[PDB]
Design an enzyme around this catalytic site. Structure first.
Site, PDB file in Angstrom:
ATOM      1  N   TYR A 126       8.986  40.284 -17.100  1.00 20.22           N
ATOM      2  CA  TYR A 126       7.530  40.351 -17.214  1.00 20.22           C
ATOM      3  C   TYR A 126       7.038  39.890 -18.593  1.00 20.22           C
ATOM      4  O   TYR A 126       6.094  39.100 -18.674  1.00 20.22           O
ATOM      5  CB  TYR A 126       7.113  41.779 -16.926  1.00 20.22           C
ATOM      6  CG  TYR A 126       5.649  42.070 -16.834  1.00 20.22           C
ATOM      7  CD1 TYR A 126       4.997  42.070 -15.614  1.00 20.22           C
ATOM      8  CD2 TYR A 126       4.935  42.437 -17.955  1.00 20.22           C
ATOM      9  CE1 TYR A 126       3.667  42.386 -15.523  1.00 20.22           C
ATOM     10  CE2 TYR A 126       3.598  42.773 -17.874  1.00 20.22           C
ATOM     11  CZ  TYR A 126       2.972  42.754 -16.658  1.00 20.22           C
ATOM     12  OH  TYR A 126       1.653  43.099 -16.559  1.00 20.22           O
ATOM     13  N   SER A 152      -1.136  39.847 -20.534  1.00 17.28           N
ATOM     14  CA  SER A 152      -0.873  41.247 -20.869  1.00 17.28           C
ATOM     15  C   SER A 152      -0.592  41.301 -22.363  1.00 17.28           C
ATOM     16  O   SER A 152      -0.302  40.281 -22.990  1.00 17.28           O
ATOM     17  CB  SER A 152       0.344  41.782 -20.089  1.00 17.28           C
ATOM     18  OG  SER A 152       0.756  43.058 -20.518  1.00 17.28           O
TER      19      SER A 152
HETATM   20  N1  LIG Z   1      -2.113  47.387 -14.909  1.00 21.96           N
HETATM   21  C1  LIG Z   1      -1.847  47.133 -16.194  1.00 21.96           C
HETATM   22  O1  LIG Z   1      -1.667  48.058 -17.019  1.00 21.96           O
HETATM   23  C2  LIG Z   1      -1.827  45.736 -16.630  1.00 21.96           C
HETATM   24  C3  LIG Z   1      -1.837  44.757 -15.691  1.00 21.96           C
HETATM   25  N2  LIG Z   1      -1.855  43.433 -16.065  1.00 21.96           N
HETATM   26  C4  LIG Z   1      -1.848  42.364 -15.068  1.00 21.96           C
HETATM   27  O2  LIG Z   1      -2.981  42.526 -14.238  1.00 21.96           O
HETATM   28  C5  LIG Z   1      -2.728  41.822 -13.011  1.00 21.96           C
HETATM   29  C6  LIG Z   1      -3.159  42.726 -11.872  1.00 21.96           C
HETATM   30  O3  LIG Z   1      -2.240  43.839 -11.848  1.00 21.96           O
HETATM   31  P1  LIG Z   1      -2.690  45.242 -11.368  1.00 21.96           P
HETATM   32  O4  LIG Z   1      -4.157  45.246 -10.983  1.00 21.96           O
HETATM   33  O5  LIG Z   1      -2.285  46.286 -12.463  1.00 21.96           O
HETATM   34  O6  LIG Z   1      -1.779  45.461 -10.093  1.00 21.96           O
HETATM   35  P2  LIG Z   1      -2.000  45.855  -8.568  1.00 21.96           P
HETATM   36  O7  LIG Z   1      -0.676  46.040  -7.951  1.00 21.96           O
HETATM   37  O8  LIG Z   1      -3.040  46.959  -8.487  1.00 21.96           O
HETATM   38  O9  LIG Z   1      -2.670  44.504  -8.046  1.00 21.96           O
HETATM   39  C7  LIG Z   1      -1.868  43.351  -7.740  1.00 21.96           C
HETATM   40  C8  LIG Z   1      -2.687  42.423  -6.867  1.00 21.96           C
HETATM   41  O10 LIG Z   1      -1.872  41.248  -6.675  1.00 21.96           O
HETATM   42  C9  LIG Z   1      -1.767  41.003  -5.294  1.00 21.96           C
HETATM   43  N3  LIG Z   1      -0.524  40.273  -5.068  1.00 21.96           N
HETATM   44  C10 LIG Z   1       0.759  40.681  -5.320  1.00 21.96           C
HETATM   45  N4  LIG Z   1       1.677  39.805  -4.980  1.00 21.96           N
HETATM   46  C11 LIG Z   1       0.942  38.748  -4.455  1.00 21.96           C
HETATM   47  C12 LIG Z   1       1.320  37.505  -3.908  1.00 21.96           C
HETATM   48  N5  LIG Z   1       2.585  37.100  -3.792  1.00 21.96           N
HETATM   49  N6  LIG Z   1       0.330  36.684  -3.452  1.00 21.96           N
HETATM   50  C13 LIG Z   1      -0.938  37.089  -3.566  1.00 21.96           C
HETATM   51  N7  LIG Z   1      -1.410  38.234  -4.065  1.00 21.96           N
HETATM   52  C14 LIG Z   1      -0.415  39.026  -4.494  1.00 21.96           C
HETATM   53  C15 LIG Z   1      -1.726  42.402  -4.695  1.00 21.96           C
HETATM   54  O11 LIG Z   1      -2.156  42.242  -3.347  1.00 21.96           O
HETATM   55  C16 LIG Z   1      -2.868  43.038  -5.480  1.00 21.96           C
HETATM   56  O12 LIG Z   1      -4.067  42.485  -4.938  1.00 21.96           O
HETATM   57  C17 LIG Z   1      -1.223  41.562 -12.975  1.00 21.96           C
HETATM   58  O13 LIG Z   1      -1.071  40.203 -13.401  1.00 21.96           O
HETATM   59  C18 LIG Z   1      -0.688  42.458 -14.092  1.00 21.96           C
HETATM   60  O14 LIG Z   1       0.376  41.746 -14.702  1.00 21.96           O
HETATM   61  C19 LIG Z   1      -1.853  43.086 -17.380  1.00 21.96           C
HETATM   62  C20 LIG Z   1      -1.836  43.988 -18.342  1.00 21.96           C
HETATM   63  C21 LIG Z   1      -1.967  45.432 -18.085  1.00 21.96           C
END
Ligand SMILES: NC(=O)C1=CN([C@@H]2O[C@H](COP(=O)(O)OP(=O)(O)OC[C@H]3O[C@@H](n4cnc5c(N)ncnc54)[C@H](O)[C@@H]3O)[C@@H](O)[C@H]2O)C=CC1
Ligand SMILES: NC(=O)C1=CN([C@@H]2O[C@H](COP(=O)(O)OP(=O)(O)OC[C@H]3O[C@@H](n4cnc5c(N)ncnc54)[C@H](O)[C@@H]3O)[C@@H](O)[C@H]2O)C=CC1
Ligand SMILES: NC(=O)C1=CN([C@@H]2O[C@H](COP(=O)(O)OP(=O)(O)OC[C@H]3O[C@@H](n4cnc5c(N)ncnc54)[C@H](O)[C@@H]3O)[C@@H](O)[C@H]2O)C=CC1
Ligand SMILES: NC(=O)C1=CN([C@@H]2O[C@H](COP(=O)(O)OP(=O)(O)OC[C@H]3O[C@@H](n4cnc5c(N)ncnc54)[C@H](O)[C@@H]3O)[C@@H](O)[C@H]2O)C=CC1
Lengths: 261, 261, 263, 247
Positions: free
Chosen positions: B155, B142
């Protein structure tokens, strides 16, 4: 003396960098609480060494991986000397291994001591600092918090994370008299480093410590010289002084040019 | 297509950025294993979405905080599709809180999932990549891995740590056909972000999601627009392609200008 | 069939050889029309044009000294007349001079600042108004690892490349709410005549004229991969930045360096 | 009796603002100081007396840092009056705010010349003596704008980034010696170059502390870099910015 009257806690200050920091803080007039994981037969000598500068010096043994013992250290300081005004998070460990065979327990321990303990100590000290309107949180990071090195995955991850934490604490306190910053040393000749040099000397140079020390140092450190514990302590005194009132969320890198190249 | 024949595993790919990455990798020709924390009624629809691009797709439920389930995910991929050639460490969580009241269990969980899980998956996948002489490890970091933000101490620490880990893995593999790099998105309109914006809207903007979204973006993101999951996926495709054979230990920041200022 | 950059007009400064030519080739392969540029007309120009044009796009050549703002303007106006509005600008013309700071020639310091930094400012200034009018643009600055770290005996080059990265950030921020992006590519060692001359100097100085050993020592000091980056890879990075997936990549660096900056 | 006692410092552009604050703090720490401005002025006696209140030897020399011959003249004047230049503070800097499209070419050139190339000329002229004497400090006054960009400051951000790059190279070329080279990166300071509700408005966008950095604090960073505890601080930045670059 610029820090006269201030109460400082230095974690992992029974040897090496931590002891150097405590010495320099005492020379600048701070009362100091020293800390080691377990009580050592050298503790009395260390306390007297630091107390030579005429401030109040105490010792409290505490495992920084245990949040209850972190709290005990803070409460001991509050009882003996008063509110913690300067917190130096220094205690940290190293384990050198390629990623594929890095032991899981060692990874966890490095994260716990080098990053999470600083979070716990900072959490416990910030309320009093906010109430008093003044504070210094000084995190001893590393060049390894800014760049990577082979076979130090856990340590580089933990030190990078400690720098990230520093930034957030600084931003959350930016309009107060509390600052948070990190010091990033390059190689310092401590036991933590002497052991690594021993390993390389046995593996590559027939046990010759002069040749191995130079090879170890010159791989990474353009100055071809070690940083000293005295210099790291001087950086800590600088950050704790009024001249640093507006230094917030940054790194003071003391590394002989390591990160410049 | 550029990734035709390559087998990819994307952790946390049932939603948001992970799903966007899986879809872009499949569009580029890769076979893809999807993963979520636990089975959900929507799993087959997500498989269908990724399979629209004519490659082989599988799904495996596994909690990435459990090293044994990470190993099971890898062995499942090896059985179903073949050796894991592209590993995307993406699964992540967020918790917003000032440092003083940040819950200890939430701190630990964020470190465990956003940093340590990537270490475990990388450790498990590296030997096969080394044996075959090719690999991609793509860590979803991130902007919060490069700078701090208030109320995101755990985070920011975890994401900084993931970037440090990336550097070390890249250096340990630099003379091989394996690369390791991180992607650093700014704000992307996923459920992880939608939830934050809804909380802000209810707490400060009377439920006005338009106003809360404007303020949320304007604070941090000079483009005043979201990054998309497709763009993050496109960055993953770029890192996995042959033109990135010598991109090692770096960050690809897709953030609308956040870190530039 | 249409390609990802089909219809876009690109100008690559200093594109008669090395990295600039590699970038021009990759942009043309991705469907862009391309204007090549060199300091002065040379007998090789025709062959270079035809090589780039083998990929089915419109290719032109224009000789212009990028240190002369009038010639930079002439390059842009030539492109507008021949092909149309400049949509992708790659600032790549740069030079090197290796010397300790104490004896660094003043004229060489000035020349490196002029070509490696100020020429990119002039070209960007000349191209931005049209990009803003059309709502789309790419400015791609060819920096270096030396824009992010220092190296001994390269004071002017490191200063100029650091400056070019700072400039990139400002241009990106001033255009952040538009369809124009500005970013920098930061290569490590690429086997070009510039690095070849540096290696020849090292070979004659320390290794007695052994090119294999000189090359290996030159690489291993700085580049953990112990291999060169290729002009094709730098071109691939340029194509990536120019493509729709990079619409929200703004003011950043794409470092293609075999791990140089990671350690 | 003081940490920099006897050290000879030259601070370019030190007749007001940050440069004067640095000169004051260096003299406070015991340094002899040469002040510098473009032209001879009234109040030059005033600024000299202000710095001399700290009990060290203070001089003034008018020199345009864009003219390499005048930079050399400044160094030679210092060597004649006080001795070898031991601490060099490069703080000839100017600013001009404009979008890139309309940025005047002569202003771009002047900002590069004073904020970057002048520091090269001064450093080049001072290094040989520092090497001979086994000690030196080159302290370059950069900015947060050398680490991040800001709208309408293209030339200044480019020049300050370049000054940080230069700093790294000089440090690496002197790393095995008693000479160090480092940069100080201030955020907003309440100088004429920068300037209740209006103040908070100007600070709010960029500086999380919602307060100005002071000239005394920038000087304190210079004293720190010049002190023995900084013998192995090489090629780095000391950022004094109220949190600007941390976010
Ligand atoms: N959304 C944003 O603005 C930003 C997000 N990120 C990173 O992107 C990555 C994806 O996040 P998002 O798509 O935004 O979130 P989201 O909540 O839409 O997706 C999270 C995914 O991780 C899975 N997950 C959560 N805990 C889990 C576990 N214990 N075991 C297996 N799977 C698990 C969830 O099922 C989902 O598939 C994260 O690492 C977040 O830190 C990085 C920078 C910007
Ligand atoms: N030595 C070096 O080259 C560098 C070291 N550092 C950091 O400096 C800090 C000090 O390290 P060094 O002085 O080199 O090592 P050291 O081995 O000399 O000192 C370790 C100190 O930490 C204490 N300690 C260890 N585990 C502890 C625990 N669980 N609870 C409480 N105290 C504990 C030990 O008692 C000792 O006081 C460490 O964080 C190290 O990461 C940073 C960069 C360079
Ligand atoms: N070669 C390397 O290892 C690296 C080079 N770079 C940068 O890549 C860019 C290209 O460098 P290389 O291809 O390696 O070198 P090169 O010497 O092969 O390329 C120079 C190109 O610039 C043209 N040129 C030179 N001065 C000019 C002027 N005043 N006006 C117009 N055109 C002029 C030359 O005609 C030639 O086309 C330069 O900016 C260099 O700084 C960046 C990082 C690594
Ligand atoms: N003011 C701020 O907020 C920040 C300033 N800086 C830098 O600090 C340095 C000092 O700036 P300020 O004190 O704020 O501005 P200022 O306008 O108060 O100081 C300018 C000083 O430089 C002298 N000077 C100007 N051009 C000169 C030349 N050609 N030759 C010799 N002397 C010359 C002027 O006489 C005056 O003494 C500048 O480099 C500025 O970029 C750094 C970061 C923050």
């Amino acid at each position: 003396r610029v820090l006269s009257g201030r109460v400082a806690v230095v974690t992992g200050s029974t040897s090496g960098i931590g002891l150097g920091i405590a010495m320099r803080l005492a020379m600048a007039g701070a009362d100091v609480v020293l800390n080691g994981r377990r009580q050592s037969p050298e503790d009395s000598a260390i306390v007297e060494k630091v107390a030579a500068y005429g401030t109040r010096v105490r010792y409290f043994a505490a495992n920084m991986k245990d949040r209850a013992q972190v709290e005990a250290l803070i409460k001991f300081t509050e009882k003996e000397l008063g509110a913690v005004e300067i917190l130096v998070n220094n205690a940290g460990i190293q384990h050198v291994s390629p990623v594929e065979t890095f032991p899981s327990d060692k990874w966890d321990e490095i994260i716990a001591l080098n990053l999470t303990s600083a979070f716990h100590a900072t959490q416990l000290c910030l309320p009093s600092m906010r109430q008093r309107g003044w504070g210094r949180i000084i995190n001893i990071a590393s060049v390894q918090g800014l760049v990577g090195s082979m076979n130090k995955s856990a340590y580089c991850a933990a030190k990078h994370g400690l720098i990230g934490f520093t930034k957030v604490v600084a931003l959350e306190t930016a309009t107060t008299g509390i600052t948070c910053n990190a010091i990033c040393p390059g190689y310092v000749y401590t036991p933590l480093v002497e052991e690594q040099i021993k390993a390389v000397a046995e593996a590559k140079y027939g046990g010759d410590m002069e040749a191995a020390t130079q090879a170890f140092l010159c791989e990474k450190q353009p100055a071809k010289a070690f940083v000293t514990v005295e210099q790291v302590g001087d950086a800590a005194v600088f950050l704790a002084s009024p001249g640093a009132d507006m230094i917030r969320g940054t790194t003071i890198t003391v590394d002989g040019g390591w990160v410049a190249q």
